């Protein structure tokens, strides 16, 4: 969910070798939290889509058989 | 695109305050490389799951019409 820009700033902040240890730990924690959530959501759309796909496949085959008959007649 | 496990490794590597200044920028790049991808696949997936969703409902509709039609013959 973090806009590539927003995420970019963080990548920035972490560039500083002299960044406090408290603030750089905080930054890496946000990357973690955000990445975990992202993966989660992506993982849903991916299982939800895989299913939605299966249904489509059934229907394509089903209809291809029916359509072969609108031709018989 | 980057296994949670794989991303977890990077975030730990970057926690070390001593890490080689050249080296943290290197790894700090992957988080931008990978994050670029992710934001993409997720957008295409959403762009695709929308479309599939529609096609699915239409296949249902065209399945109903095909069937019913063959029955008139």
Curated annotation (Swiss-Prot), chains A, B:
Residues 39-61 form a coiled coil. The lineage of its organism: Viruses, Duplodnaviria, Heunggongvirae, Uroviricota, Caudoviricetes. Keywords: Coiled coil, DNA-binding, Late protein, Viral capsid assembly, Viral release from host cell. Homodimer. Interacts non-specifically with DNA; probably binds DNA in the early stages of DNA packaging. GO terms for biological process: virion assembly. Transmembrane segments: none annotated. The gene is 7. Disulfide bonds: none annotated. Scaffolding protein involved in the icosahedric procapsid assembly. Coassembles with the capsid proteins to form the procapsid. The scaffolding protein is found within the capsid as a serie of concentric shells. During DNA packaging, the scaffolding protein molecules are released from the procapsid. This is Capsid assembly scaffolding protein. The chain holds residues 2 to 74 of 98 of the full protein. One of its GO terms (molecular function) is DNA binding. The keyword Coiled coil applies. GO terms for cellular component: viral scaffold. Belongs to the phi29likevirus scaffolding protein family. Changing residue 55 to K: Forms procapsids which have incorporated the connector. Defective in producing infectious virions.
């Amino acid at each position: 969910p973090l806009k590539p820009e927003e995420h970019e700033d963080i990548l920035n902040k972490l560039l500083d070798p002299e960044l406090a240890q408290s603030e750089r730990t905080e930054a890496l924690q946000q990357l973690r939290v955000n990445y975990g959530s992202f993966v989660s959501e992506y993982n849903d759309l991916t299982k939800s889509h895989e299913k939605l796909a299966a249904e489509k496949d059934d229907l394509i085959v089903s209809n291809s058989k029916l359509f072969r008959q609108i031709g018989l007649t």
